[PDB]
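Tokens for Cannulae forming protein. Go.
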Amino acid sequence: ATGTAQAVSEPIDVESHLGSITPAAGAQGSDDIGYAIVWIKDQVNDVKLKVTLANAEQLKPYFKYLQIQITSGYETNSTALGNFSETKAVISLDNPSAVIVLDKEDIAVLYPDKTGYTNTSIWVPGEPDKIIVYNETKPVAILNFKAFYEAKEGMLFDSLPVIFNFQVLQVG
């Protein structure tokens, strides 16, 4: 039922890349709240990960609504490898938790020959500056999170740090 971090680290590694929310003066917008990295020791078939916004109640009082979309994918300079971006799940203040399913195709592939030109980089979709791996090949899965929100009128507030919760549902 419950048991997070009890005996030694898990066979897989998770890296939470979190960003904060800032109000903008105009009408409404969307911003990247952060991303998550799944370090695969060696070729995986699938992975189930549930994400739940634990800090929602904390930042909810000054917003009208918050919608967080989870995207699985990659970006590279070499089009020959052909990447793909697809939304796996969208959570909201009404649905703080959702199930995430990673595909083997989402897992990066290593090339002993390094086809597609050497010395290339891989980054989160839409962000070339968000380089995950450069001049190195290791299978990992990246999950991007985009938030949809509008600050409620009349409230003065500072930036909100984002907190996400992860619970392993099943592996392999």
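The chain has one domain: 13-21+28-171.
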